[PDB]
């Protein structure tokens, strides 16, 4: 083999940054949705204003509007948290049912109950560890699990744990999927992702709403990405942002998910 990858170099540089450098680096040049209004409304109990429950709805919007993902049918959302991906999925015409599962509890996000469009086809279940749930068939499989660590070895071990669990769900044959890959950047991870692409298809995409402090990419059924090239391009973007001036954030309006129930 050839030793340290570009993403491993990125992680080592990230760990050596001072806190002041990290503070400016983490958002340099990223895209960000404005959330102050949504958070205030949600704090006020507004359920019909179209507000997204988290920044996650915008991440899924980015993938869907570009054709990386075409959700349909029964959607299962593993690690749904407050529900940003589940509520976004429920607004999509071809989606018919959304079931989110999340752990909840101290230090973890609980599902939030709002009345964005299609809320009546969404069921969010807390108190569920998806690593100990039997996999079920679905049409679209979503998973946004993976806890960051300063150790790249820990990030790799955590990502392999996520992907092994997701493989049990992929074996039930959904036609669409979107899976967070916390660590795509070690040699073991790139080999694993190539194997997974051969069996299940799809490819990796970097969402520009991700912060520069994580190398996360999304494995989606509609990408046709060379694993090594897509990971390397992302490592180069993240490394390049470690040099030179702070780049401005590209602010965007957050997703508005509307209101009202869906008919059947
Ligand atoms: C990145 S957040 C997901 C955000 C979500 N996609 C959204 O748009 O709001 C990942 C969620 O997975 C949950 N989680 C982590 N491990 C879990 C597990 N083993 N079982 C179920 N949920 C888990 C975390 O508590 C967290 O709320
Ligand atoms: Cl997580």
mmCIF file of N, CA, C and O in Angstrom, residues 183-216:
data_model
loop_
_atom_site.group_PDB
_atom_site.id
_atom_site.type_symbol
_atom_site.label_atom_id
_atom_site.label_comp_id
_atom_site.label_asym_id
_atom_site.label_seq_id
_atom_site.Cartn_x
_atom_site.Cartn_y
_atom_site.Cartn_z
ATOM 1 N N UNK A 183 -16.718 8.263 7.789
ATOM 2 C CA UNK A 183 -15.306 8.191 7.424
ATOM 3 C C UNK A 183 -15.179 7.454 6.106
ATOM 4 O O UNK A 183 -15.203 6.212 6.081
ATOM 5 N N UNK A 184 -15.036 8.156 4.978
ATOM 6 C CA UNK A 184 -14.761 7.473 3.707
ATOM 7 C C UNK A 184 -13.283 7.444 3.328
ATOM 8 O O UNK A 184 -12.965 6.986 2.227
ATOM 9 N N UNK A 185 -12.385 7.868 4.219
ATOM 10 C CA UNK A 185 -11.080 8.387 3.790
ATOM 11 C C UNK A 185 -9.889 7.504 4.134
ATOM 12 O O UNK A 185 -8.770 7.833 3.715
ATOM 13 N N UNK A 186 -10.057 6.439 4.904
ATOM 14 C CA UNK A 186 -8.961 5.514 5.126
ATOM 15 C C UNK A 186 -8.921 4.488 3.994
ATOM 16 O O UNK A 186 -9.887 4.313 3.240
ATOM 17 N N UNK A 187 -7.778 3.815 3.863
ATOM 18 C CA UNK A 187 -7.655 2.778 2.839
ATOM 19 C C UNK A 187 -8.701 1.693 3.036
ATOM 20 O O UNK A 187 -9.338 1.255 2.072
ATOM 21 N N UNK A 188 -8.900 1.255 4.286
ATOM 22 C CA UNK A 188 -9.902 0.235 4.564
ATOM 23 C C UNK A 188 -11.275 0.727 4.146
ATOM 24 O O UNK A 188 -12.065 -0.017 3.563
ATOM 25 N N UNK A 189 -11.588 1.995 4.433
ATOM 26 C CA UNK A 189 -12.912 2.492 4.077
ATOM 27 C C UNK A 189 -13.113 2.554 2.575
ATOM 28 O O UNK A 189 -14.194 2.209 2.082
ATOM 29 N N UNK A 190 -12.088 2.969 1.824
ATOM 30 C CA UNK A 190 -12.277 3.066 0.382
ATOM 31 C C UNK A 190 -12.439 1.678 -0.231
ATOM 32 O O UNK A 190 -13.254 1.488 -1.140
ATOM 33 N N UNK A 191 -11.693 0.689 0.276
ATOM 34 C CA UNK A 191 -11.872 -0.678 -0.191
ATOM 35 C C UNK A 191 -13.255 -1.192 0.163
ATOM 36 O O UNK A 191 -13.913 -1.853 -0.655
ATOM 37 N N UNK A 192 -13.720 -0.890 1.378
ATOM 38 C CA UNK A 192 -15.042 -1.351 1.790
ATOM 39 C C UNK A 192 -16.120 -0.737 0.915
ATOM 40 O O UNK A 192 -17.058 -1.426 0.484
ATOM 41 N N UNK A 193 -16.004 0.568 0.646
ATOM 42 C CA UNK A 193 -16.999 1.266 -0.154
ATOM 43 C C UNK A 193 -17.010 0.764 -1.593
ATOM 44 O O UNK A 193 -18.084 0.635 -2.196
ATOM 45 N N UNK A 194 -15.842 0.411 -2.143
ATOM 46 C CA UNK A 194 -15.814 -0.183 -3.478
ATOM 47 C C UNK A 194 -16.539 -1.524 -3.493
ATOM 48 O O UNK A 194 -17.309 -1.818 -4.422
ATOM 49 N N UNK A 195 -16.328 -2.343 -2.459
ATOM 50 C CA UNK A 195 -17.026 -3.625 -2.382
ATOM 51 C C UNK A 195 -18.521 -3.407 -2.292
ATOM 52 O O UNK A 195 -19.315 -4.113 -2.936
ATOM 53 N N UNK A 196 -18.936 -2.442 -1.464
ATOM 54 C CA UNK A 196 -20.363 -2.175 -1.290
ATOM 55 C C UNK A 196 -20.999 -1.656 -2.572
ATOM 56 O O UNK A 196 -22.152 -1.991 -2.885
ATOM 57 N N UNK A 197 -20.266 -0.845 -3.332
ATOM 58 C CA UNK A 197 -20.780 -0.350 -4.600
ATOM 59 C C UNK A 197 -20.979 -1.481 -5.596
ATOM 60 O O UNK A 197 -21.942 -1.473 -6.371
ATOM 61 N N UNK A 198 -20.088 -2.468 -5.595
ATOM 62 C CA UNK A 198 -20.252 -3.579 -6.523
ATOM 63 C C UNK A 198 -21.520 -4.357 -6.220
ATOM 64 O O UNK A 198 -22.251 -4.757 -7.137
ATOM 65 N N UNK A 199 -21.814 -4.568 -4.935
ATOM 66 C CA UNK A 199 -22.967 -5.367 -4.553
ATOM 67 C C UNK A 199 -24.271 -4.593 -4.681
ATOM 68 O O UNK A 199 -25.277 -5.150 -5.121
ATOM 69 N N UNK A 200 -24.273 -3.323 -4.283
ATOM 70 C CA UNK A 200 -25.493 -2.567 -4.092
ATOM 71 C C UNK A 200 -25.639 -1.360 -5.004
ATOM 72 O O UNK A 200 -26.741 -0.795 -5.057
ATOM 73 N N UNK A 201 -24.585 -0.950 -5.712
ATOM 74 C CA UNK A 201 -24.665 0.166 -6.631
ATOM 75 C C UNK A 201 -24.400 1.496 -5.952
ATOM 76 O O UNK A 201 -23.929 1.562 -4.812
ATOM 77 N N UNK A 202 -24.701 2.570 -6.679
ATOM 78 C CA UNK A 202 -24.617 3.912 -6.126
ATOM 79 C C UNK A 202 -23.185 4.428 -6.067
ATOM 80 O O UNK A 202 -22.263 3.882 -6.676
ATOM 81 N N UNK A 203 -23.012 5.530 -5.346
ATOM 82 C CA UNK A 203 -21.726 6.214 -5.290
ATOM 83 C C UNK A 203 -21.777 7.266 -4.212
ATOM 84 O O UNK A 203 -22.817 7.505 -3.598
ATOM 85 N N UNK A 204 -20.636 7.896 -3.977
ATOM 86 C CA UNK A 204 -20.481 8.820 -2.860
ATOM 87 C C UNK A 204 -20.589 10.254 -3.347
ATOM 88 O O UNK A 204 -20.051 10.604 -4.403
ATOM 89 N N UNK A 205 -21.218 11.096 -2.536
ATOM 90 C CA UNK A 205 -21.357 12.519 -2.840
ATOM 91 C C UNK A 205 -21.070 13.345 -1.586
ATOM 92 O O UNK A 205 -21.559 13.038 -0.494
ATOM 93 N N UNK A 206 -20.315 14.430 -1.753
ATOM 94 C CA UNK A 206 -20.120 15.397 -0.683
ATOM 95 C C UNK A 206 -21.210 16.471 -0.786
ATOM 96 O O UNK A 206 -21.414 17.064 -1.858
ATOM 97 N N UNK A 207 -21.954 16.687 0.303
ATOM 98 C CA UNK A 207 -22.978 17.738 0.331
ATOM 99 C C UNK A 207 -22.349 19.031 0.844
ATOM 100 O O UNK A 207 -21.727 19.013 1.913
ATOM 101 N N UNK A 208 -22.472 20.160 0.140
ATOM 102 C CA UNK A 208 -21.719 21.369 0.541
ATOM 103 C C UNK A 208 -22.232 22.057 1.792
ATOM 104 O O UNK A 208 -21.567 22.983 2.300
ATOM 105 N N UNK A 209 -23.355 21.604 2.332
ATOM 106 C CA UNK A 209 -23.863 22.033 3.632
ATOM 107 C C UNK A 209 -23.115 21.355 4.774
ATOM 108 O O UNK A 209 -23.275 21.758 5.930
ATOM 109 N N UNK A 210 -22.332 20.317 4.490
ATOM 110 C CA UNK A 210 -21.544 19.713 5.556
ATOM 111 C C UNK A 210 -20.478 20.697 6.002
ATOM 112 O O UNK A 210 -19.907 21.437 5.197
ATOM 113 N N UNK A 211 -20.143 20.652 7.287
ATOM 114 C CA UNK A 211 -19.082 21.519 7.751
ATOM 115 C C UNK A 211 -17.725 20.944 7.353
ATOM 116 O O UNK A 211 -17.561 19.746 7.132
ATOM 117 N N UNK A 212 -16.718 21.814 7.310
ATOM 118 C CA UNK A 212 -15.369 21.369 6.938
ATOM 119 C C UNK A 212 -14.709 20.545 8.031
ATOM 120 O O UNK A 212 -13.689 19.905 7.762
ATOM 121 N N UNK A 213 -15.272 20.538 9.232
ATOM 122 C CA UNK A 213 -14.756 19.750 10.346
ATOM 123 C C UNK A 213 -15.136 18.268 10.277
ATOM 124 O O UNK A 213 -14.765 17.520 11.181
ATOM 125 N N UNK A 214 -15.900 17.840 9.266
ATOM 126 C CA UNK A 214 -16.183 16.426 9.060
ATOM 127 C C UNK A 214 -15.958 16.081 7.597
ATOM 128 O O UNK A 214 -16.234 16.895 6.708
ATOM 129 N N UNK A 215 -15.469 14.868 7.355
ATOM 130 C CA UNK A 215 -15.258 14.356 6.004
ATOM 131 C C UNK A 215 -16.475 13.546 5.519
ATOM 132 O O UNK A 215 -16.389 12.832 4.519
ATOM 133 N N UNK A 216 -17.605 13.648 6.208
ATOM 134 C CA UNK A 216 -18.765 12.825 5.855
ATOM 135 C C UNK A 216 -19.132 12.964 4.378
ATOM 136 O O UNK A 216 -19.087 14.058 3.793
#
